[PDB]
Structure formats: C-alpha cells, structure tokens
Design a protein around this ligand. Structure first.
Ligand code: 7XU
Ligand code: 7XU
Lengths: 301, 309
C-alpha cells in the first residue's frame, strides 16, 4: 500500500541536530514543516551513508513501501522518504532514545519487571515480522527504541537489505554463509536479551570479530548474566544453538517471558529490586497522554 | 472511584518548569512547559495554565474534586486534564498543541479554508459538547478561542469547568457568547451551551470576525431582547444560518440539542458545496490518504471525518 509511504521534497523539512550514527548512516533530529503552515514538527531523520553498490531507485522505493507497511506496536514504521542525491528516511522522534543507551544510564536502578517486559515486547515485534515473512537481519539493543519506559519498539527494519557487519550479534551460519532467516534473527534476539540483562555490556568484549566464528565453533557462548536465573539464561543459550531449527520460535519466547513477568523477582535477582519502581496507573496514564497515544503489559501476580 | 484517582496526576514544582507564555485569558496565563519524569533526563513539552486567583476561593479539597472531574472527561474532542500542581498557585497541566487555537487558525488561514473543514469542525465541536451533556457537565464558556487544533482535521474543546472553578465577580466575561438567561440571571445549562455553540459556529464561518463588533457589552441584553442577532455570513446558505438562528432563540427548550446538531451538521458535510459557498472550494479539499496517514503518525495517534458523497 503506497498510501502508507509519503515522499517529501527537501524544502518541507530541516535537520537541526545530530543524534547519533551507525554503519548505515547518520541520524538527525529534524523538523517537518507542513506546507502553508507555521508549525515545526520534530522527526528523526536518517541520511543514508552513500551507497556503495547503489541500487536502482525503483528498488529503493519498493523496499520503502514494505518498510512503510509495518504495522505493529513494537516495530517502528517508516513514515516518509526523501530521495535526491541522497536517501533520507523519516520516522517518529523518540525522546527517550535507544534502549541500549537507556539501560546503561539506569544501570543498576532498573527493576526486574521492566527488563522482562522489554524482552516480551521485542519478541512480540519480531513475531510480527515473522508472520509477515520479513527478516530484520540486524536486531540489536541499539536498534530498539524507547517510546516510554513501558513501551519499546524495534527500529531499522529493512535497512540491512537496503544497503561494519555486526559479527558479535550474528548467527554462525550468517557469519559463514551470509544466510539470514527468522532463526538467525532469533540468534540476534538472544544477544539483544543478553545486552539488556548486563545493562548494556558489550558482547564478547576484548575478543576481536575475526576470532568470533572460531569461538562459537568451540562452543563458547556469552556468560550467564549476574542478575539472571538459570531459567532466563537457558532461553538465551537456546537462541544460540548451532542447529537453527533447534532455536526457539518467537511465539514461544513471548509466552516464556510473559510467564516470568508474572513473577519477575523469581526470575531476576537484582539488588534493591524491592526499592525499584514499576509504573503506577496514575503514572501510566500521564505517560500515555503526553507521549504514547497508540494502541498497546504483564504485571506481577 | 479508583479509576478517577488514577486519571489526575499530582505534580510537584520540582517535576515541571514553565518556559514560555503561549497566551493569556480571563482564567489565567498559559505556558509551554516541560515535564521531567523523576529519575529521567528527558524533558517533555506540556501546556501549563496558571490560574488567576479565584473569585472568592475554595479549599484545595474543593479544588481537587473539581479537578478530578476535569481529569475525568474521555472523548476525542474534549481536552482532558492530565495533572495539577496546587502547592502555591494552582497550575493545570495538559497536552500541548502546536497548531494552537482554532480562532487564530481561521484568522491565519481565512483565504485558504474549505467547506469540508468548516462543517467537520462544527460536527466535532458538537460531538464534544454532547459528550459533556451526557456527563451532566456544562462548559459555560464555549468559544472559538476555547477550541484547540490537534491537527487541521481534528479539533478539541478546552477549558471545561474553569468557569465554575474560577467563578466571576458580578462587577472578561464572555457576554457576547452568552445566552440571555445567563446574562440576566446567570442561568447556565446545556441549552445555554447550545447558544454559545451558535456563536462559535458564527466565529468560524466569518473566519474569526468578532461578534457584535461596535456594540457595547453592556448593551447586549437589550439588543437581544429586541430580537437582534448576528448577521448571516456571506459564505453561509440559509439552511446554515437558520440553524445558527435556532441556537439563539430566547426560549431555551426551543433551541436545538447537541445530538440534533451533530446529525444535521454531519448531513451537511456529505454535501459541503451545497451548504456553503466558497470561492476556490474545489481547490480546498480534505487531505489525501497519504497526507492523512503521515499526519496521524506524527501528531495524531489517538482514536473520523465525514467526506463528500
Ligand atoms: C546524548 N543523547 C544521545 C541520544 N539522544 C537521543 C537519541 C535518539 C532519540 N530519539 C530517536 N528517535 C527516533 C530515532 N530513530 C532512530 N533511528 C532511525 C533509524 C532509521 C530511520 C530513522 C531513525 N534513532 C536513532 C537510534 C540510534 C541512536 C541514534 C538515533 C532515533 N532516535 C532521542 C534522544 C539524546 C542525546
Ligand atoms: C503568538 N502565538 C502564541 C501562541 N501560540 C500557540 C499557543 C498554544 C498552542 N498550543 C496550545 N496547546 C495547548 C493549549 N492549552 C491551552 N489552554 C489551556 C487551558 C487550560 C489548561 C491547559 C491549557 N492553550 C491555549 C489556547 C488559547 C491561547 C493560549 C493557549 C493551548 N495552546 C500553540 C500555539 C502560537 C504563537
């Protein structure tokens, strides 16, 4: 459905500051000016890194439409595109920024309930892509966005297809043969979950990328996170099985994490966890009106 | 109820900072403000209205019960009160709308506004008021100034319950928007809200013309008593003007009910050209599906519009 993607002229928006960057490109906080209107509306703009092996414009657009069609509460939807000399992608700007940064910032101060819920939400997002026969190919903590602390969405879907390689998040078959599948995504999902539990620790730190395929073949895997019970780590371990069909399906993951969300304290052992706050209804209603109006969580009991 | 307790957020002064004044009103002064959630680095833009001291005042608990009622409203076309800070000055916190009030917008865009927009705005405002009437609530101050634009396609009534909470001295009062019974005896009812709706529709059709310009506020009851009314706008057909005329009938029960208005204005929207005459109207048309989709994603994720047959 083309109605979903809006092509924009350069004049109708401006980049005002840099938010970050990736292997893919640079991201800017931008302002959209509706023509004939006096408002400026904040957006996030990614200007694509320039185009080694440039693809036909029609191909870019077809990929954009698919990108534009994503309709789930936990997957970011591509809103607009401006293509000139350069390709620029427009999406909603999220004040909280990315999940990897958010966990680092609140490093030991995050409650077990938030963490398990995030795992559920990402899995729900991934499940949606699988239903649609779509492979993200680059799931990572940096590519999850915080709409509100209680709501997160996967971003950057389609980009990897659109254009270094993230070896440390990759499935062994993908590293070896460039094979990408939902199951490979499952592998990345496990790594992403490992990032959350360790509060944004870098995976395989101190081990170079070239060594990584070799460590994996040996049977080495990321270590059990300090807050994680065996019940959680095992799911991660399963995600990293060599035989891909052996790895869990995204649907199963939603259930396991949801069950855990019901009794977070049993699953995650975090210092001061009792002290930590999981969001009140009054607080939740305030958050929704201000930031998160859209349709969309598991609580202890 | 518990549900009520949840809807209104008690705010500390530490929680928010006022940054800029968006305007001033009889009720108070309005600022674009930033909310900082505890333990967070983000600042969230919000609208804070800081209340002018009430005509003879009420206890905070009294203030609070009324605030719970305001936080209570849950309709697409009525602004809901998100939060309150009562520590010193009374401050009301609500969602910030970039487009601003509808009255300024029509004034700004008078050359560029289509029939489809105008009729739809009437449907939406009537819908919101009908919702308040169902809740057994009287706004008491309807005016174009008190309607906010979420997006050009979507509008919301604001400032509900302020009049009652604030009061007014007998000795700033929206006389020209008021029903005669309200002016003379200070009777306020849904039927009086209906009269205001008539004036608000007038404000829109004339594109922000002041009502009764050149007539003193003091003279207003008399001119009305004589059967004087606001003139028919050039754009408006007789069928529209008559509806406005019904709204200003002296007998309250004779006046239209909001549900009736919703239906009638809704019918009109289906054939917009028939009911209003605007030069270049075919150029001025509702946003296409692509623009509509974009707009909603950026600004309007909540919750229709009636389009031509
Ligand atoms: C020192 N900090 C740095 C982080 N920061 C911040 C960063 C991002 C946001 N919000 C936001 N919103 C939407 C985004 N969409 C993409 N990504 C993206 C991908 C494809 C198309 C459009 C955007 N991003 C990226 C996510 C990775 C890190 C850079 C911003 C986005 N980021 C709010 C605050 C505030 C200052
Ligand atoms: C020279 N002008 C200055 C004004 N301006 C502007 C002002 C407000 C907004 N948006 C916005 N949003 C929420 C509002 N909530 C109340 N009012 C309000 C009342 C009670 C509780 C909370 C808000 N307002 C009033 C609407 C009438 C004029 C003063 C701002 C609001 N207005 C957008 C643009 C554009 C440039």
């Amino acid at each position: 459905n083309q109605a979903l993607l809006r092509i924009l002229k350069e004049t109708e928006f401006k980049k005002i500051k840099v938010l970050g960057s990736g292997a893919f490109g640079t991201v800017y906080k931008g302002l959209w000016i509706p023509e004939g209107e006096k408002v400026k509306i904040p957006v996030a703009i990614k200007e694509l890194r320039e185009a080694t092996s440039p693809k036909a414009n029609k191909e870019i657009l077809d990929e954009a439409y698919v990108m534009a069609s994503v309709d789930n509460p936990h997957v970011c939807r591509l809103l607009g595109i401006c293509l000139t000399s350069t390709v620029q992608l427009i999406m909603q700007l999220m004040p909280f920024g990315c999940l990897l940064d958010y966990v680092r910032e609140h490093k030991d101060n995050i409650g077990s309930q938030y963490l398990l819920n995030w795992c559920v939400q990402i899995a729900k997002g991934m499940n949606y892509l699988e239903d649609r026969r779509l492979v993200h190919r680059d799931l990572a903590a940096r590519n999850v966005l915080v709409k509100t602390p209680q709501h997160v969405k996967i971003t950057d879907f389609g980009l990897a297809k659109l254009l270094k390689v993230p070896i440390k998040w990759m499935a062994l078959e993908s590293i070896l043969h460039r094979i990408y599948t939902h199951q490979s995504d499952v592998w990345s999902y496990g790594v992403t979950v490992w990032e959350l539990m360790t509060f944004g620790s870098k995976p395989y730190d101190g081990i170079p990328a070239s060594e990584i395929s070799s460590i994996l073949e040996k049977g080495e895997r990321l270590p059990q996170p300090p807050i994680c019970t065996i019940d959680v780590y095992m799911i991660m371990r399963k995600c990293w099985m060599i035989d891909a069909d052996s790895r869990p399906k995204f649907r199963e993951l939603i259930i396991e994490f949801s069950k855990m969300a019901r009794d977070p304290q049993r699953y995650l052992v975090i210092q001061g966890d009792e002290r930590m706050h999981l969001p009140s209804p009054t607080d939740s209603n305030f958050y929704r009106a201000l930031m998160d109006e859209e349709d969309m969580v598991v609580d202890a009991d």
